[PDB]
Design brief:
The chain is α+β, with helices and mostly antiparallel strands and 57 residues long. The chain has one helix at residues 24-37, and strands at residues 2-9, 14-21, 43-47, 52-56. It has one domain: Ubiquitin-like (UB roll) (Roll), CATH 3.10.20.
């Protein structure tokens, strides 16, 4: 398990978390939890070179 990172860019908030997962698909399902928990919804992207998801409100 690699780690994957989430960058959340809310209008007024900024969030950065990681998780260990078997692939990007598994980390994405955990990250949807974190983003919904923290009331930040937006457009999702994944950057394979950095194993990073960004969510921008």
């Amino acid at each position: 398990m690699d780690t994957y990172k989430l960058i959340l860019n809310g209008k007024t908030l900024k969030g950065e978390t990681t998780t260990e997962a078997v692939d990007a698909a598994h980390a994405e399902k955990v990250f949807k939890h974190y983003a919904n928990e923290h009331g930040v919804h937006g457009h999702w992207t994944y950057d394979p070179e950095t194993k990073t998801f960004t969510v921008t409100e």
